[PDB]
Ligand SMILES: COc1ccc(C[C@@H]2NC(=O)/C=C\C[C@@H]([C@H](C)[C@H]3O[C@@H]3c3ccccc3)OC(=O)[C@H](CC(C)C)OC(=O)C(C)(C)CNC2=O)cc1Cl
């Protein structure tokens with residue numbers, strides 16, 4: 114395919130995406146020194162998707178990391194595989210990016226959008242053709258939500274043709290020090306719905322819930338959850354990274370997946386839930402993967418899909434596997450759950466098969482759905498926002514920073530209309 | 544790397560500043576001849592004590608503060624007190640005639656002819672600064688100089704510097720040491736014209752300080768050296784956060800963020816616990832759990848109001864010496880006994896703690912003695928409406944029959960100002976009462 118440009122925002126983005134780069138780089142078998150270790154061509158069939166050659170025809174990841182809190186550069190260059198990146202895009206701010214919008218959205222950051230467009234165009238010059246973008250960020254704080262929406266709009270202006278994809282992390286009361294989050298989340302998704310092509314709801318509420326109620330870890334840190342999300346988003350990327358029969362692409366994924374012109378929020382899931390292990394593992398086999406793919410406590414959104422409907426479905430299986438067996442159980446799952454799925458698009462539950470095992474697990478898969486259950490998450494966020502908003506709170510910060518009340522009101526109008534749209538498409542008929 | 548400027552207005556303000564600056568000397572080991580052996584005597588600083596002392600090439604550590612008085616009766620005393628050599632050649636402000644308990648005289652007649660000099664002094668001091676956070680002004684609601692001139696100063700500052708914040712320390716004057724009867728008009732007329740240019744203001748009630756000194760200090764005659772010393776100790780304890788070194792609550796901006804939800808609600812209430820009686824050598828020992836247990840008692844707060852009737856916003860804390868955060872967590876668990884505690888539904892809760900690894904400093908030859916641990920809870924309660932209601936009762940009584948009104952009208956004020964300020968304070972107390 115054509116090349117992909119990766120964009121990384123804020124502390125959360127930098128950490129999550131650095132771990133993701135590590136995960137796939139191990140998967141594609143590339144050394145920290147850029148040395149080559151892979152033992153087959155099937156590893157480098159789609160290495161050009163991300164990695165670019167060096168002067169020594171040494172493959173280098175192509176990504177950009179953005180933030181304003183200048184303490185992140187050393188965090189980048191202190192990870193295990195951190196020094197992997199080109200010493201040209203470690204461009205950051207110098208005076209902090211306190212979690213206030215219109216500071217990174219209007220006040221500043223808008224002064225460095227020239228810098229970020231300069232760097233992204235500079236490294237897409239070496240890109241023979243452009244496929245799309247990978248913005249990783251979270252919905253809280255300026256560097257993060259505000260910069261992410263600003264970047265999305267800017268590149269949408271400059272590149273109206275290609276695709277625009279992003280990963281969303283929604284901060285939650287369960288693990289959050291600050292409290293100015295719901296304002297950030299709603300102000301973000303308002304830009305996000307109307308300005309991107311597809312987005313992944315990598316939630317924290319469901320993440321914490323499952324990690325504490327089954328994985329039962331004492332202190333969910335930026336280490337554990339970083340590992341979880343890096344693994345899952347690697348699993349999502351595999352389908353493009355691998356050659357598959359369901360030989361899907363970003364534009365193809367949009368066309369196949371996108372049901373409405375404003376409902377492009379996915380629910381990345383993973384069947385074999387995995388903590389920080391040492392040995393190979395305790396063994397898992399096919400029917401276990403079948404069951405745990407679509408359980409109630411394995412996704413990344415605190416919702417039970419049996420209370421809703423799927424617009425579409427998608428999966429990407431891993432490891433040496435019986436394709437006929439897989440098709441048999443999938444046919445049964447689409448047979449024994451007739452009401453579970455929408456009647457608007459038959460032949461929606463698509464399936465693919467991959468070969469390279471995950472670097473640590475034998476037989477796994479990667480669930481990338483598109484449900485009508487996401488209304489629960491959006492309703493949650495909007496309700497907490499308006500609870501913080503019915504009486505003013507810190508809102509003087511925003512108003513004195515540049516917004517007005519009308520922008521907040523219209524953001525809520527847009528979100529509640531979106532929830533109405535999801536409700537409507539969730540209660541269709543024949 | 545972040546400068547700070549303070550300023551003293553009025554007799555109460557200048558006396559408090561006198562009582563505070565020598566405490567500030569003591570804390571860092573600064574002495575009227577001190578040199579703080581770890582410095583180069585040429586700007587040796589940029590630590591958290593640089594925010595006040597802009598030390599010169601003479602190794603002097605001159606401060607950043609000026610004192611205001613409409614008629615020299617206390618500013619002279621600091622000019623010829625103890626730390627005489629500690630101030631510049633006539634950097635201070637001296638007048639010729641006080642506002643004499645008349646808000647109007649300082650707000651329209653006298654100060655409106657002296658203010659420009661004060662602003663020139665403030666600007667000239669600020670020029671030597673590089674990274675000023677904001678101002679910390681000391682005044683009182685009692686007289687007309689420390690009140691009318693303060694409100695006028697607020698207007699002038701907000702005109703010339705609106706971006707920067709400016710924390711406030713105020714006194715809610717009490718009948719006990721009442722040196723007038725026209726205080727309530729000044730108080731309403733100052734709180735009404737303070738909001739639009741205020742950001743966060745602390746009131747310390749001379750009723751409360753008087754009660755504390757008479758009860759738990761074994762003093763029956765609280766001069767302006769006893770209550771003054773106690774308030775200086777409280778102020779030093781509260782500002783120690785920015786003063787000594789880095790922890791919770793570094794900056795005035797951070798004060799606002801973690802304290803004030805709603806710009807019409809920005810009067811935080813400060814509580815204390817260690818009230819060491821006197822030179823009494825031996826009573827018993829002390830525990831950190833004990834002092835944090837005591838910091839909830841209504842008798843031990845800087846302003847009289849019983850908070851078992853209302854809800855808190857953000858109950859910060861500070862500590863001196865003997866770190867033990869597990870004991871602090873136990874303290875939170877204990878105070879969770881929900882007998883007299885509350886929080887507000889909308890926003891979650893945080894008991895942010897910052898530790899100073901220096902034992903609290905004490906007045907050497909004063910009514911106290913050195914201890915090892917200290918703590919001060921700045922609970923932004925909703926109960927702070929008691930003071931406003933109490934003062935509103937008296938203002939309404941006096942305005943019933945238009946008493947004393949001429950002494951304000953005949954000086955450059957209109958009759959409608961009183962009514963509109965009363966209505967505005969009514970709106971303010973409504974804004975407190977509705978939260979819940
Ligand atoms: C009702 O009173 C309350 C008071 C406090 C609390 C919890 C209290 N609150 C907050 O400030 C949370 C969001 C308000 C934003 C506001 C809305 C954004 O514009 C900010 C801004 C940033 C920089 C410059 C100018 C403006 O501020 C902050 O995030 C700042 C970060 C900066 C100052 C380092 O502080 C923190 O992040 C803290 C203090 C470490 C996070 N923690 C808390 O325990 C709860 C209640 Cl209910």
Ligand SMILES: Nc1nc2c(ncn2[C@@H]2O[C@H](COP(=O)(O)OP(=O)(O)OP(=O)(O)O)[C@@H](O)[C@H]2O)c(=O)[nH]1
Pocket residue numbers: 552553554555556558559612613614616641642643644683684685686687688689690716720721722749767770771
């Ligand atoms: N220093 C100090 N002042 C106090 C105390 N209690 C009350 N005051 C106030 O001290 C004030 C005297 O200073 P101002 O208010 O400026 O008096 P003024 O008449 O405006 O002008 P000056 O007397 O020249 O200062 C009165 O308003 C009292 O309410 C206390 O314990 N210490």
Ligand SMILES: Nc1nc2c(ncn2[C@@H]2O[C@H](COP(=O)(O)OP(=O)(O)O)[C@@H](O)[C@H]2O)c(=O)[nH]1
Pocket residue numbers: 122123124125126128129210211212251252253254255256257258282283284285288289290294317335338339
């Ligand atoms: N660093 C980090 N933050 C996360 C993660 N998952 C959720 N978050 C939340 O994302 C928010 C961090 O926002 P951030 O990007 O730091 O805003 P910034 O201060 O403007 O950079 C916090 O609410 C975190 O709780 C994670 O894996 N890593």
